[model samples]
Target: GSHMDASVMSTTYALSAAQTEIWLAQQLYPDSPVYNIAQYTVIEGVIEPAVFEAALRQVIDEADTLRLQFIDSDDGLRQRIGTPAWSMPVLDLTAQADPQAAAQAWMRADYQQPVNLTQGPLFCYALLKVAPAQWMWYQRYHVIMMDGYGAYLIAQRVAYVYSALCEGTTPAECDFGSILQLLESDAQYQISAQRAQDEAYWLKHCANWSEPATLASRSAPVLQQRLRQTTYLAIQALGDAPDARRLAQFMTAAMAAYLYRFTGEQDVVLGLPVKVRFGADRHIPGMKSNTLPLRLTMRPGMNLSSLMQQAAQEMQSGLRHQRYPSEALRRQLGMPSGQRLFGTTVNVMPFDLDLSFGGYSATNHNLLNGPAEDLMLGVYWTPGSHQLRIDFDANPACYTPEGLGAHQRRFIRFMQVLAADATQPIDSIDLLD
Candidate 1:
């Protein structure tokens, strides 16, 4: 659980224009909390629950966006800050049957539960005291209030406070107030001619979107039912290069190649999620990993190196104009707010951390927020293992799970081929192996 000083100044501001689009999505689908995101991590420490409670209070004192209540009004959607309704009810299974199983079940349900953004206290924190030394903290947060980067900051804030508490000392001054609003109203980011030009470049591309393409075609009455599938593959040594950027770029090319093979569409657009937070990013409590379209032009003679170079360039180009909202981009590109502009996306979400606090153990899992398209390739990594998780959602009416798996397998093999030889031509590479 995280919140900021109620004694300190609280803020009331309208949602970002980008956020307003999300607000609109909520209005359209009031029941589906597709935006709701939360994760469960376990911790081990030679500490007292009471001291930990103090640490939680300290984090809330430091981060303002932690305690926010969303209110809808005639003007727009606004946030109100206050104290977090934080609590932890210990579940003792010392004498109970299969206490571990009970705890596991509790964590699963805790993660799936949706939050009520309107009433406030967007962060839900609870703990289970499995033993005096080992415990689990399930922290649920609304994506609207804070983002993955903010969540990263939360982990750091908790570590600092926990260490300080163990030493019987106060946590050092780290960060204060909110960097969330700074992303929008900062004078430095005032619209410029270059900005307008970037907007024009995007409007031209987004406006010409082709009749939506699907990576997989299935025939099932999906209108009355939800249709989506995810595949998590543990990929090793795709690129053992010291930097993750290489692997990210390589995977982008691999997916781009896969789409080309499947759709025979030379000019392909794949959605990529981008995060916004800078001067303060070195530190977030609200964030958005907005999805941007990466339009790749593939040809018969193109080599893997050429594809990767184009992918990197597209990444740089798209990021410069990422401030534009996705739905608005959809509208400008000729698709209505409700229409889907893209069927595939690639997300490279990497987290690096020193997972220790006063000799305690902490583990955070990668809990994805389900795929939002026919195909979403999510790349996640840890010090111990890395994976290429494929979320493939198809209309069962035209595609089958087995058919999608064939595409998924070919994509992985294609990745290995490129890793072995970047100069290999697109037409020459074969998935026969």
Candidate 2:
């Protein structure tokens, strides 16, 4: 192994705001790749694997995070850039009768292989060749380096570079120093009044963290087993007067309401993975998002619409200060050391990319679990399919399959009930039964 020196032309700097929670999650759940994202694109065309492979290499070489590594230190977490060969492997599955299934089986195993934080090379790509002009473009990355927005850019850039290279044209060298500068700027802002205010807001939200409803029995799963199920909803049923804002508020309130009944807790704090892309990073490819916790205090005799409105307001306020560090929030809130901030989280993909590259189809980015939270309510809004897939990723050690399944059904029914009748009383909502 050629040390971390030769491969890294980039400077070693402090990790950014969004990286804090993710780094800690890795330490907490070392075996789970819930933080790793694997995107697959199936390509079918009269092309050369050599040419396609070369194009992907070009994109990787251009991107800095593609060669990123996280190192743990006494001071805090830090990151460095390093490239290790053989990270991108091409496998032949043409001999297998069910090549696609074989490829999925391979990925299922590979996705569980944890990335060595202390070593290097956090990103990897794989090509599965089934027959001539047919292959699987499997790109997997660690959250320490990339996020959903960034992955879109990666795919778009790769598709462009691949086509250009196949046509014997050279693409311009991408300047990644701007992203490095972003990190330095974030660190500088962390010392300012805005940062303080952001921290203060979070402190208040998590100030009274008194044993909120946990989807899992134990903090960390004993067996480390994962249970995931999805709830599908047609977009047409989203609203009678539907706006994206209402959908978010509806989902947020439903989860909070569900917690109230399921665990018999009136005060619920639901976590949402909000995007925090700033002025310069709106287009830059990196981890530009963070998870935010919204505390909803449901009162008796309240209507669903009232709760939904409060949720919308809370979400907007939370997103404004989304850059507030989670670790800092926990520390200020007086949470015990090594304790996670929240038990459950909510995710909504406001965007989707079912794109095509040179006639090759790109699959919608399927987010997998890494046990970052006890349970996550993942909402996928696909306009193309006119459907929403609500997936709950829970720990088996914490809840039974039947219990989680019931929760999933009720969550969806709760959304349907609320969206259909905003004036309905929260107590009258019959989703749980």
Candidate 3:
């Protein structure tokens, strides 16, 4: 092999050990379909092509990891490794767009398709000028290098850069802790006796637990379900105000209350995934994420507000514990070795702050999209609108669609009632017809 000098870009970031483990797992199972992750965002605002181009360039400059691609290295067997530095390539949507028709032109300008690792660029950005003060910006990123949370960070950084450019100011340097530090800290925590105890507890409790529920239609005639006979509903706290701080508090409480009231257990368990990229290690990207299940017990007959308060307390702790493998917890508790442990999971998407970017105003924006496992319930929160969307992807054979629909209605009704009166006990809410 020729000794080619591969240029490594200088960065203060690196990957944590846990992230490294997940990356290795992806490498080992390269043929596994688990690595496929794709997502897109539709941005509507005023179009300033010059501003957007500059902002886009700023984005590339700020995140070097975003520009790199994965390459297979010949080490015994071919192993996938990321190229050390980034290359900026202009994205062309000309072939996909129709210049004559306005609607067709918008379609061509708005749609962003992804490029393979072996292809030119790892990311793509598209700009469509719809009207005098309206434009659409779309960006697509491969999931191997980023997760939902990581995307939030990138969006936040982009906004900061875009805003700075809009105001004719230099963007302030982004400050954050390295992923390596978090990984090292997590490694120390995972090997502790307390973590072992936590693992044992989850195993004992989740044993005999069926796999977290899966959508029956997932393996049916269609590879993916189309939007047909679909209904959209929104639930929010009173005042219709986006109170993120309070909403976070309310979510924590609701989960604890739900578990205690239904299952007669104060201790609750749930799983969450966290991004593993940190410092100079950003080059080693793959499915560098891990799921961590957290267990917490509420007091017997705990009040709704109190339960929520407990949830707020446990949220950060749960994220910290996410470094340990889900399998380790199953084995420790001596639960059935091959089953999803948690019956439920929750993830709060980052809030959308800027509706006006490039020249179009983004209206009716909703960020709830993903596969919902057949867990008893999958709760997602979008604090921007003070709305919580619950996807109850239950077993179709066991749970009727009508019943699930009825349950969803009742759940929202119950939340509305509770939001008005946090003091009301769970039993006090009328559940039976």
List lDDT for all candidates, in order. 0.64, 0.71, 0.47
Instruction: Give one digit per residue, the lDDT tens place, for model 1 in 1-433.
Output: 2344332224566666555766766665555555555655667765466776778787877777777667665555676665557675556554657666777777656655555677645676666766656676666676677666677778778877887888888678877546455544432343556556666878876666664455666322222112335556655536534245556677777787877876788877777777755555445566655778777778987888898888888777677777666766676666654466666777776665345666687876545353244566766555445555555544445566677667666777777777777787877776653
Off by over 4 Å in 1: 1-11, 44-47, 93-101, 129-134, 176-195, 205-207, 218-236, 240-242, 382-410, 428-433
Q: Write the per-residue lDDT of candidate 3 for residues 1-433, one digit (tens) a residue.
A: 3443122222222333433443454454343323233333444444456676787676665554465444433321111233434332233333444522543434333222223444434455555454444444544454445555555556656656666777788878764333343434556665688576656544554554443322222322111211111223455344425355455456445654555555666556655544544453333323345555645556664557766666566655454444456666555555653345664554444345344442334532222222233333434454555445455544333345676676556555666676777776776776533
Give the best candidate by lDDT.
Answer: 2
On the 0 to 100 scale, the lDDT of residue 408 in model 1 is 66
State how far residue 362 of model 2 sits from its true place (Å): 2.4
> What TM-score does structure 3 among the candidates reach?
0.61
Q: Pick the candidate with the highest TM-score.
A: 2
Predicted structure 2: clash tally: 3
Q: For model 2, how does the per-residue alpha-carbon lDDT over 104-155 read when each residue is reduced to its tens digit?
A: 8887777767777666446667778767677777777787778877877787
Stretches of model 2 off by over 4 angstroms after superposition: 1-11, 28-32, 43-48, 70-77, 129-135, 166-177, 215-218, 221-225, 240-244, 338-341, 367-369, 383-385
**Can you give the TM-score per candidate against the true fold?**
0.82, 0.86, 0.61
